[PDB]
Design a protein around this nucleic acid. Structure first.
Ligand SMILES: Nc1ccn([C@H]2CC[C@@H](COP(=O)(O)OP(=O)(O)OP(=O)(O)O)O2)c(=O)n1
Ligand SMILES: [Mg+2]
Ligand code: NA
Length: 360
DNA sequence: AAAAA
DNA sequence: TTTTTGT
DNA sequence: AAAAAC
Protein backbone atom coordinates (compact mmCIF):
# COMPACT_ATOMS: atom_id res chain seq x y z
CA UNK A 1 0.00 0.00 0.00
CA UNK A 2 3.11 2.25 0.58
CA UNK A 3 4.95 4.27 -2.14
CA UNK A 4 8.07 2.69 -3.75
CA UNK A 5 10.98 5.11 -3.41
CA UNK A 6 12.98 6.33 -6.43
CA UNK A 7 16.14 5.62 -4.34
CA UNK A 8 17.61 2.08 -4.23
CA UNK A 9 18.82 2.84 -0.62
CA UNK A 10 15.09 3.08 0.38
CA UNK A 11 14.21 -0.29 -1.28
CA UNK A 12 14.93 -3.90 -0.27
CA UNK A 13 16.35 -5.73 -3.28
CA UNK A 14 16.98 -9.43 -2.75
CA UNK A 15 18.31 -11.78 -5.47
CA UNK A 16 14.81 -13.10 -6.19
CA UNK A 17 14.11 -11.17 -9.35
CA UNK A 18 10.55 -11.77 -10.71
CA UNK A 19 11.12 -9.42 -13.68
CA UNK A 20 14.30 -10.81 -15.34
CA UNK A 21 12.62 -10.61 -18.83
CA UNK A 22 12.32 -6.82 -18.40
CA UNK A 23 15.57 -6.16 -16.45
CA UNK A 24 17.79 -8.25 -18.82
CA UNK A 25 16.51 -6.04 -21.71
CA UNK A 26 16.90 -2.78 -19.69
CA UNK A 27 20.48 -3.81 -18.63
CA UNK A 28 21.41 -4.33 -22.34
CA UNK A 29 19.94 -0.89 -23.30
CA UNK A 30 21.79 0.76 -20.38
CA UNK A 31 25.07 -0.92 -21.36
CA UNK A 32 24.69 0.33 -24.97
CA UNK A 33 24.09 3.93 -23.76
CA UNK A 34 27.24 3.58 -21.55
CA UNK A 35 29.21 2.58 -24.65
CA UNK A 36 27.70 5.46 -26.73
CA UNK A 37 28.74 7.80 -23.77
CA UNK A 38 25.01 8.75 -23.29
CA UNK A 39 25.27 8.99 -19.46
CA UNK A 40 21.72 10.32 -18.90
CA UNK A 41 19.90 7.63 -20.93
CA UNK A 42 22.24 5.00 -19.39
CA UNK A 43 21.37 6.04 -15.85
CA UNK A 44 17.59 6.14 -16.61
CA UNK A 45 17.68 2.53 -17.91
CA UNK A 46 19.84 1.44 -14.87
CA UNK A 47 17.30 3.06 -12.43
CA UNK A 48 14.30 1.42 -14.23
CA UNK A 49 16.02 -1.98 -14.16
CA UNK A 50 16.93 -1.50 -10.45
CA UNK A 51 13.34 -0.62 -9.36
CA UNK A 52 11.90 -3.66 -11.24
CA UNK A 53 14.48 -5.93 -9.46
CA UNK A 54 12.90 -4.79 -6.10
CA UNK A 55 9.29 -5.88 -7.09
CA UNK A 56 7.77 -8.85 -5.17
CA UNK A 57 5.75 -9.94 -8.24
CA UNK A 58 6.25 -10.15 -12.06
CA UNK A 59 4.76 -7.39 -14.31
CA UNK A 60 2.11 -9.13 -16.52
CA UNK A 61 0.17 -6.02 -17.78
CA UNK A 62 0.76 -2.26 -18.18
CA UNK A 63 -1.64 -1.63 -15.20
CA UNK A 64 0.98 -3.37 -12.98
CA UNK A 65 3.45 -0.48 -13.67
CA UNK A 66 1.15 2.19 -12.05
CA UNK A 67 2.86 4.16 -9.26
CA UNK A 68 6.29 2.61 -9.90
CA UNK A 69 8.95 5.39 -10.08
CA UNK A 70 11.83 5.63 -12.65
CA UNK A 71 9.48 4.31 -15.43
CA UNK A 72 9.04 7.02 -17.99
CA UNK A 73 7.40 6.81 -21.43
CA UNK A 74 10.46 5.22 -23.14
CA UNK A 75 10.82 2.53 -20.45
CA UNK A 76 7.02 1.80 -20.49
CA UNK A 77 7.18 1.31 -24.32
CA UNK A 78 9.94 -1.31 -23.79
CA UNK A 79 7.85 -3.08 -21.06
CA UNK A 80 4.76 -3.00 -23.39
CA UNK A 81 6.76 -4.65 -26.23
CA UNK A 82 8.06 -7.44 -23.90
CA UNK A 83 4.46 -8.08 -22.58
CA UNK A 84 3.35 -8.32 -26.28
CA UNK A 85 5.55 -11.28 -27.45
CA UNK A 86 8.11 -12.01 -24.66
CA UNK A 87 10.91 -10.11 -26.50
CA UNK A 88 12.40 -6.61 -26.67
CA UNK A 89 12.98 -5.51 -30.29
CA UNK A 90 15.17 -2.63 -28.92
CA UNK A 91 17.44 -4.97 -26.88
CA UNK A 92 17.52 -7.49 -29.84
CA UNK A 93 18.84 -4.70 -32.16
CA UNK A 94 21.59 -3.83 -29.56
CA UNK A 95 22.61 -7.56 -29.27
CA UNK A 96 23.07 -7.66 -33.09
CA UNK A 97 24.96 -4.28 -33.24
CA UNK A 98 28.67 -4.70 -34.19
CA UNK A 99 29.87 -1.88 -31.91
CA UNK A 100 28.01 -3.36 -28.94
CA UNK A 101 29.29 -6.94 -29.61
CA UNK A 102 32.92 -5.71 -29.95
CA UNK A 103 32.74 -3.61 -26.79
CA UNK A 104 31.41 -6.57 -24.73
CA UNK A 105 34.07 -8.93 -26.16
CA UNK A 106 37.07 -6.54 -25.80
CA UNK A 107 36.24 -5.24 -22.29
CA UNK A 108 35.81 -8.90 -21.13
CA UNK A 109 39.68 -8.89 -21.05
CA UNK A 110 41.19 -7.77 -17.71
CA UNK A 111 43.08 -4.57 -18.36
CA UNK A 112 40.82 -3.46 -21.29
CA UNK A 113 38.28 -0.71 -20.59
CA UNK A 114 36.06 1.62 -22.67
CA UNK A 115 38.94 3.67 -24.25
CA UNK A 116 41.08 0.66 -25.40
CA UNK A 117 37.95 -1.26 -26.63
CA UNK A 118 36.79 1.81 -28.64
CA UNK A 119 40.34 2.22 -30.08
CA UNK A 120 40.54 -1.44 -31.25
CA UNK A 121 37.02 -1.27 -32.78
CA UNK A 122 37.87 1.93 -34.75
CA UNK A 123 41.10 0.18 -35.92
CA UNK A 124 38.92 -2.56 -37.48
CA UNK A 125 39.54 -5.38 -34.95
CA UNK A 126 36.63 -7.77 -34.30
CA UNK A 127 38.21 -10.86 -32.63
CA UNK A 128 40.55 -11.40 -29.64
CA UNK A 129 42.78 -13.76 -31.73
CA UNK A 130 43.45 -10.96 -34.30
CA UNK A 131 44.24 -8.50 -31.45
CA UNK A 132 46.67 -10.91 -29.62
CA UNK A 133 48.60 -11.87 -32.79
CA UNK A 134 48.95 -8.26 -34.13
CA UNK A 135 52.65 -7.19 -34.37
CA UNK A 136 52.06 -3.39 -34.00
CA UNK A 137 49.87 -3.43 -30.80
CA UNK A 138 51.64 -3.13 -27.39
CA UNK A 139 49.95 -4.59 -24.29
CA UNK A 140 50.04 -3.40 -20.65
CA UNK A 141 51.11 -5.90 -17.92
CA UNK A 142 47.42 -6.00 -16.82
CA UNK A 143 46.28 -6.90 -20.44
CA UNK A 144 49.02 -9.60 -20.76
CA UNK A 145 47.58 -11.27 -17.59
CA UNK A 146 44.05 -10.63 -18.95
CA UNK A 147 44.85 -12.62 -22.13
CA UNK A 148 46.99 -15.34 -20.44
CA UNK A 149 44.23 -16.22 -17.85
CA UNK A 150 41.25 -15.18 -20.07
CA UNK A 151 39.14 -18.41 -19.90
CA UNK A 152 39.46 -18.66 -16.08
CA UNK A 153 38.70 -14.93 -15.53
CA UNK A 154 35.67 -14.93 -17.91
CA UNK A 155 34.10 -17.89 -16.10
CA UNK A 156 32.66 -16.48 -12.97
CA UNK A 157 33.76 -17.26 -9.44
CA UNK A 158 31.28 -19.48 -7.61
CA UNK A 159 30.53 -19.68 -3.79
CA UNK A 160 32.85 -22.73 -3.04
CA UNK A 161 35.70 -20.84 -4.83
CA UNK A 162 34.93 -17.54 -2.96
CA UNK A 163 34.90 -19.43 0.36
CA UNK A 164 38.21 -21.16 -0.46
CA UNK A 165 39.70 -17.71 -1.31
CA UNK A 166 38.31 -16.27 2.00
CA UNK A 167 40.11 -19.04 3.94
CA UNK A 168 43.43 -18.29 2.11
CA UNK A 169 43.10 -14.51 2.73
CA UNK A 170 42.13 -14.88 6.43
CA UNK A 171 44.87 -17.49 7.07
CA UNK A 172 47.59 -15.28 5.41
CA UNK A 173 46.39 -11.99 7.03
CA UNK A 174 46.08 -13.23 10.71
CA UNK A 175 49.59 -14.88 10.33
CA UNK A 176 51.13 -11.36 10.00
CA UNK A 177 48.46 -9.28 11.89
CA UNK A 178 46.70 -11.53 14.49
CA UNK A 179 44.17 -8.87 15.60
CA UNK A 180 43.09 -8.03 11.99
CA UNK A 181 39.43 -8.12 11.00
CA UNK A 182 38.92 -9.56 7.48
CA UNK A 183 35.54 -9.21 5.83
CA UNK A 184 34.56 -10.49 2.40
CA UNK A 185 32.67 -7.63 0.69
CA UNK A 186 31.14 -7.13 -2.80
CA UNK A 187 28.50 -9.41 -4.29
CA UNK A 188 29.33 -12.45 -2.11
CA UNK A 189 28.54 -10.38 1.05
CA UNK A 190 25.16 -9.50 -0.60
CA UNK A 191 24.41 -13.28 -0.93
CA UNK A 192 25.41 -13.79 -4.58
CA UNK A 193 26.14 -17.26 -5.92
CA UNK A 194 28.63 -15.90 -8.47
CA UNK A 195 30.95 -12.92 -9.01
CA UNK A 196 33.65 -11.57 -11.37
CA UNK A 197 36.05 -11.34 -8.36
CA UNK A 198 36.35 -11.81 -4.54
CA UNK A 199 36.78 -8.59 -2.53
CA UNK A 200 37.97 -8.16 1.08
CA UNK A 201 38.20 -5.37 3.60
CA UNK A 202 41.04 -5.64 6.12
CA UNK A 203 41.36 -3.45 9.24
CA UNK A 204 43.21 -3.69 12.59
CA UNK A 205 42.27 -2.00 15.92
CA UNK A 206 45.77 -2.07 17.45
CA UNK A 207 48.18 -2.02 14.43
CA UNK A 208 50.68 0.85 14.10
CA UNK A 209 50.80 3.10 10.97
CA UNK A 210 53.78 1.02 9.70
CA UNK A 211 52.15 -2.38 10.53
CA UNK A 212 48.97 -1.27 8.69
CA UNK A 213 51.01 -0.15 5.65
CA UNK A 214 53.16 -3.34 5.49
CA UNK A 215 50.42 -6.02 5.80
CA UNK A 216 49.46 -6.14 2.03
CA UNK A 217 53.22 -6.31 1.13
CA UNK A 218 53.85 -9.16 3.67
CA UNK A 219 50.77 -11.18 2.57
CA UNK A 220 51.54 -10.84 -1.21
CA UNK A 221 55.31 -11.61 -0.66
CA UNK A 222 54.26 -14.80 1.22
CA UNK A 223 52.00 -15.84 -1.75
CA UNK A 224 54.76 -14.83 -4.27
CA UNK A 225 57.17 -17.20 -2.39
CA UNK A 226 54.57 -19.99 -2.90
CA UNK A 227 54.08 -19.19 -6.59
CA UNK A 228 50.40 -18.28 -6.03
CA UNK A 229 50.64 -14.64 -7.15
CA UNK A 230 49.81 -14.55 -10.92
CA UNK A 231 49.28 -10.75 -10.99
CA UNK A 232 49.81 -8.15 -8.27
CA UNK A 233 49.35 -4.38 -8.26
CA UNK A 234 49.57 -2.62 -4.86
CA UNK A 235 48.21 0.95 -4.80
CA UNK A 236 49.61 2.90 -1.86
CA UNK A 237 47.19 4.91 0.23
CA UNK A 238 46.63 8.58 -0.62
CA UNK A 239 44.22 8.81 2.37
CA UNK A 240 44.23 12.18 4.12
CA UNK A 241 41.89 12.44 7.13
CA UNK A 242 40.67 16.03 6.37
CA UNK A 243 41.29 16.50 2.58
CA UNK A 244 38.43 17.01 0.08
CA UNK A 245 38.32 14.38 -2.80
CA UNK A 246 39.37 17.06 -5.44
CA UNK A 247 38.20 14.81 -8.38
CA UNK A 248 34.60 15.03 -9.76
CA UNK A 249 34.95 11.41 -11.08
CA UNK A 250 37.40 9.32 -8.96
CA UNK A 251 36.69 5.61 -9.64
CA UNK A 252 38.91 4.48 -6.74
CA UNK A 253 38.94 5.45 -3.11
CA UNK A 254 42.12 6.63 -1.44
CA UNK A 255 42.72 3.55 0.82
CA UNK A 256 45.71 1.22 0.28
CA UNK A 257 44.56 -1.63 -1.99
CA UNK A 258 45.77 -4.41 -4.23
CA UNK A 259 44.36 -5.95 -7.38
CA UNK A 260 45.42 -9.54 -7.62
CA UNK A 261 45.13 -12.69 -9.67
CA UNK A 262 45.66 -15.70 -7.42
CA UNK A 263 46.37 -19.31 -8.32
CA UNK A 264 43.53 -21.26 -6.61
CA UNK A 265 44.36 -24.97 -6.37
CA UNK A 266 41.45 -27.35 -6.89
CA UNK A 267 42.27 -29.17 -3.58
CA UNK A 268 41.34 -26.01 -1.61
CA UNK A 269 37.80 -25.88 -3.16
CA UNK A 270 35.11 -27.95 -1.38
CA UNK A 271 32.37 -28.18 -4.04
CA UNK A 272 33.58 -33.28 -13.32
CA UNK A 273 37.05 -33.12 -14.99
CA UNK A 274 40.10 -31.67 -13.15
CA UNK A 275 42.14 -30.05 -16.00
CA UNK A 276 45.30 -28.08 -15.03
CA UNK A 277 44.37 -28.55 -11.34
CA UNK A 278 43.94 -24.80 -10.54
CA UNK A 279 41.90 -21.67 -11.46
CA UNK A 280 42.99 -18.02 -11.86
CA UNK A 281 40.85 -15.80 -9.59
CA UNK A 282 40.57 -12.02 -9.44
CA UNK A 283 40.98 -10.92 -5.76
CA UNK A 284 40.90 -7.35 -4.37
CA UNK A 285 42.18 -6.48 -0.89
CA UNK A 286 41.52 -3.11 0.77
CA UNK A 287 43.28 -1.95 3.97
CA UNK A 288 41.60 0.90 5.78
CA UNK A 289 42.33 2.74 9.07
CA UNK A 290 40.25 1.24 11.91
CA UNK A 291 38.07 4.38 12.44
CA UNK A 292 36.93 4.45 8.75
CA UNK A 293 35.99 0.68 8.66
CA UNK A 294 32.19 1.29 8.54
CA UNK A 295 32.40 3.74 5.59
CA UNK A 296 34.77 1.42 3.66
CA UNK A 297 32.56 -1.69 4.35
CA UNK A 298 29.46 0.22 3.21
CA UNK A 299 31.19 1.44 0.01
CA UNK A 300 32.75 -1.95 -0.86
CA UNK A 301 29.58 -4.02 -0.15
CA UNK A 302 27.67 -2.43 -3.03
CA UNK A 303 25.74 -2.94 -5.26
CA UNK A 304 26.97 -0.10 -7.57
CA UNK A 305 23.32 1.18 -7.91
CA UNK A 306 22.78 1.02 -4.12
CA UNK A 307 26.04 3.09 -3.60
CA UNK A 308 25.02 5.72 -6.27
CA UNK A 309 21.56 6.20 -4.69
CA UNK A 310 23.00 6.33 -1.12
CA UNK A 311 25.22 9.26 -2.22
CA UNK A 312 22.37 10.88 -4.27
CA UNK A 313 19.94 10.62 -1.32
CA UNK A 314 22.64 12.04 1.07
CA UNK A 315 23.19 15.07 -1.28
CA UNK A 316 19.61 15.87 -2.43
CA UNK A 317 17.59 14.86 0.64
CA UNK A 318 19.96 15.47 3.61
CA UNK A 319 22.55 18.05 2.27
CA UNK A 320 25.23 15.51 3.28
CA UNK A 321 28.31 14.28 1.41
CA UNK A 322 29.09 10.55 1.59
CA UNK A 323 32.02 8.45 0.23
CA UNK A 324 34.07 5.31 1.18
CA UNK A 325 36.03 7.29 3.78
CA UNK A 326 33.54 9.65 5.50
CA UNK A 327 30.16 11.41 5.92
CA UNK A 328 30.01 15.21 6.07
CA UNK A 329 27.02 17.34 7.17
CA UNK A 330 27.04 20.62 5.20
CA UNK A 331 24.41 22.30 7.47
CA UNK A 332 26.01 21.33 10.83
CA UNK A 333 29.51 21.78 9.25
CA UNK A 334 30.73 18.55 10.92
CA UNK A 335 31.99 15.10 9.91
CA UNK A 336 29.75 12.35 11.28
CA UNK A 337 31.49 9.32 12.88
CA UNK A 338 30.29 5.69 12.71
CA UNK A 339 31.43 2.37 14.24
CA UNK A 340 28.98 0.31 12.08
CA UNK A 341 26.93 0.50 8.85
CA UNK A 342 23.78 0.80 11.02
CA UNK A 343 25.11 4.12 12.47
CA UNK A 344 25.71 5.45 8.87
CA UNK A 345 22.10 4.58 7.90
CA UNK A 346 20.85 6.24 11.16
CA UNK A 347 22.89 9.48 10.41
CA UNK A 348 21.23 9.58 6.94
CA UNK A 349 17.73 9.04 8.43
CA UNK A 350 17.37 5.73 6.52
CA UNK A 351 15.90 2.42 7.72
CA UNK A 352 18.72 -0.12 7.86
CA UNK A 353 19.02 -2.22 4.67
CA UNK A 354 20.70 -5.63 5.24
CA UNK A 355 23.63 -6.50 2.85
CA UNK A 356 21.56 -9.27 1.11
CA UNK A 357 18.85 -6.55 0.50
CA UNK A 358 21.31 -4.22 -1.35
CA UNK A 359 21.19 -6.05 -4.73
CA UNK A 360 19.81 -2.98 -6.56
C1' DA B 1 15.70 9.22 -20.23
C1' DA B 2 13.39 10.75 -15.97
C1' DA B 3 12.53 13.97 -12.38
C1' DA B 4 13.56 18.16 -10.01
C1' DA B 5 14.26 22.99 -9.75
C1' DT C 1 12.01 25.87 -19.78
C1' DT C 2 17.04 24.38 -17.75
C1' DT C 3 19.65 21.39 -14.48
C1' DT C 4 20.91 17.07 -12.52
C1' DT C 5 22.14 12.39 -12.67
C1' DG C 6 27.79 9.03 -7.19
C1' DT C 7 32.60 9.39 -7.08
C1' DA D 1 51.29 10.08 -20.69
C1' DA D 2 46.33 8.07 -21.08
C1' DA D 3 44.41 4.08 -19.26
C1' DA D 4 43.10 0.52 -15.97
C1' DA D 5 42.09 -1.68 -11.70
C1' DC D 6 36.55 -0.87 -7.54
N1 LIG E 1 31.08 1.74 -10.24
C1 LIG E 1 31.23 1.06 -9.04
C2 LIG E 1 31.93 -0.20 -8.97
C3 LIG E 1 32.06 -0.80 -7.72
N2 LIG E 1 31.49 -0.19 -6.59
C4 LIG E 1 31.62 -0.76 -5.24
C5 LIG E 1 30.39 -1.52 -4.83
C6 LIG E 1 30.83 -3.01 -5.23
C7 LIG E 1 32.33 -3.02 -4.85
C8 LIG E 1 33.04 -4.16 -5.62
O1 LIG E 1 32.99 -3.85 -6.99
P1 LIG E 1 32.67 -5.06 -7.99
O2 LIG E 1 33.66 -6.23 -7.66
O3 LIG E 1 32.69 -4.68 -9.47
O4 LIG E 1 31.20 -5.26 -7.49
P2 LIG E 1 30.33 -6.55 -7.23
O5 LIG E 1 29.18 -6.01 -6.46
O6 LIG E 1 31.17 -7.38 -6.17
O7 LIG E 1 29.91 -7.54 -8.38
P3 LIG E 1 30.69 -8.87 -8.84
O8 LIG E 1 29.91 -9.96 -7.99
O9 LIG E 1 30.60 -9.02 -10.28
O10 LIG E 1 32.24 -8.86 -8.35
O11 LIG E 1 32.76 -1.68 -5.14
C9 LIG E 1 30.81 0.99 -6.74
O12 LIG E 1 30.32 1.57 -5.77
N3 LIG E 1 30.73 1.58 -7.92
MG1 LIG F 1 33.04 -8.00 -6.69
NA1 NA G 1 38.10 -5.12 -19.00
Amino acid sequence: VKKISQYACQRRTTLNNYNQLFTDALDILAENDELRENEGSCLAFMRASSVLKSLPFPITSMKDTEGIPCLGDKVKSIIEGIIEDGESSEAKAVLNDERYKSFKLFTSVFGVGLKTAEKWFRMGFRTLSKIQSDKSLRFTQMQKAGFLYYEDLVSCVNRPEAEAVSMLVKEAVVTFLPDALVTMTGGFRRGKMTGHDVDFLITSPEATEDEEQQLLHKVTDFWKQQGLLLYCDILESTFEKFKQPSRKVDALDHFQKCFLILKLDHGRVHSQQEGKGWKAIRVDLVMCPYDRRAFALLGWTGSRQFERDLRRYATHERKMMLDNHALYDRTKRVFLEAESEEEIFAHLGLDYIEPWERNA
